[PDB]
């Protein structure tokens, strides 16, 4: 039901993104390849892992226009602000990191799916000539997550995650 | 000799090894530099996963070769 690090990379390859670089917060120490983030425009980050825990949480960094970066936490805005300060220090100088203001209570333990799905839609929404406000991007994310769960999304995503976990270790 | 171990997170780890080093010893060396327990490590070279009980010479790993390190971690 949880997406492994290799499973995340395999997902983006099958989606036509090639070989991606991801990030992590391992034992409290972040590893963010900002050159790859600038080139990819996004980066899934596996947090909450370390020497005594292999099961954590997926979040998504997003590069906007100019020097703007965004953090999409599937657990909601306040969960994302817990990572904002340590992840901001990893960005190039002159950058600003903003947490996408989406609602809480909709992750359902499917952060790997939300990052690879809603996170990319948030990436395209923020990287266009006339983008909606940051308030509107988070509200769209909250509504889409809630609408997918309303359409039996938990049973469909957990089933799809078990399939991907079966085609890999 | 020096070898390079590349993670999926972009980091490159340089290791001092000998061709007769076992895979378990190479994993233990990675733990001393990065702190990752060997149970979390998957070592890859030439599209092959290195098995415990064998040595680097069994896979024809030379000086300044590049290995890949996938970690047994997940999230939800």
**Which residues of chain A have a CB within 8 Å of the CB of B41?**
none
**φ and ψ of A89, to 5 deg:** -65, -10
Helix (H) or strand (E) holding B35: none
Binary contact (B73, A169; C-beta < 8 A): no
Task: Please give the residue of chain B at the shortest CA–CA distance from A50.
Answer: B36
Q: Determine contact, residues A61/A34, Cβ cutoff 8 Å.
A: no
**Which member of B37, B42, B73 has the closest CB to residue A46?**
B73
What DSSP designation does B56 have?
A: G
What is d(CA A31, CA B45) in angstroms, rounded to the nearest whole number? 23
Q: Which two tokens stand for residue A38?
A: 């600038």
Q: How many CB pairs under 8 A join A and B?
A: 76
What is d(CA A162, CA A86) in angstroms, rounded to the nearest whole number? 32
Domain extent at residue B56: 2-71
Q: Which two tokens stand for residue A169?
A: 């270790």
Residue B12 lies in a domain: yes
Unique residue bearing structure tokens 């809630």:
A146
Q: Cα A41–B11–A32 angle (5° rounding)?
A: 40
CA B30 to chain centre: 7
Q: Determine contact, residues A16/A87, Cβ cutoff 8 Å.
A: no
Domain extent at residue A95: 5-166
Give the CATH number, domain containing residue A94.
Answer: 3.40.395
Q: Cα A90–A31–A34 angle (5° rounding)?
A: 50
Residue B67 lies in a domain: yes
Q: Which two tokens stand for residue A18?
A: 């090639």
Angle between helices A111-126 and A134-150 (to 10 degrees): 140
Helix (H) or strand (E) holding A138: helix A134-150
**Which residues of chain A have a CB within 8 Å of the CB of B11?**
31, 33
As beta bridge partners, residue A43 has A61
Give chain B's domain count.
1
**Which residues of chain A have a CB within 8 Å of the CB of B73?**
4-5, 24, 46, 49, 54-56
**Which residues of chain A have a CB within 8 Å of the CB of B71?**
5
What DSSP designation does A63 have?
A: E
Residue B35 lies in a domain: yes
Task: Please give the residue of chain B at the shortest CA–CA distance from A6.
Answer: B70
Q: How many residues does chain A have?
A: 169
Give chain A's domain count.
1
Question: Which distant-in-sequence residues (6+ apart) come within 8 Å of A80 by Cβ?
Answer: A59, A71, A72, A73, A99, A100
Unique residue bearing structure tokens 């992750």:
A107
- The CA R_g of chain A, rounded to the nearest whole Å, is 15
Q: Which two tokens stand for residue B28?
A: 């233990």
Kindly provide the resolution of this structure in angstroms, with one decimal. Answer: 2.6
Q: Which two tokens stand for residue B30?
A: 């990675």
Q: Give the method used.
A: X-ray
């Amino acid at each position: 039901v949880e997406l492994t690090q290799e499973g995340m990379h395999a997902i983006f390859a099958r989606m036509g993104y090639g070989d991606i670089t991801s990030g992590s917060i391992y034992n409290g120490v972040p590893t963010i390849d900002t050159g790859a983030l600038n080139r990819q425009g996004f980066m899934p980050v596996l947090t909450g892992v370390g020497p005594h825990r292999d099961s954590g949480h997926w979040i998504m960094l997003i590069k906007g226009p100019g020097n703007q970066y965004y953090l999409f936490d599937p657990l909601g805005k306040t969960s994302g602000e817990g990572y904002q300060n340590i992840l901001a220090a990893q960005l190039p100088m002159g950058s600003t990191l903003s947490v996408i203001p989406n609602g809480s209570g909709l992750n359902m333990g499917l952060a790997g799916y939300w990052v690879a799905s809603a996170g990319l839609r948030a990436h395209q929404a923020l990287n266009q000539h006339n983008p909606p406000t940051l308030l509107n991007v988070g509200q769209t994310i909250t509504n889409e997550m809630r609408n997918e769960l309303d359409h039996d999304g938990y049973r469909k995503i957990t089933g799809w995650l078990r399939a991907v976990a079966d085609e890999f270790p | 000799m020096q070898i390079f171990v590349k993670t999926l997170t972009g980091k490159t780890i340089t290791l001092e090894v000998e061709p007769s080093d076992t895979i378990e010893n190479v994993k233990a060396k990675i733990q001393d530099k990065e702190g990752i327990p060997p149970d979390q490590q998957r070592l890859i070279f030439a599209g092959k996963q290195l098995e415990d009980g064998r040595t680097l010479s069994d896979y024809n790993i030379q000086k300044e070769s590049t290995l890949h390190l996938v970690l047994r971690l997940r999230g939800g």
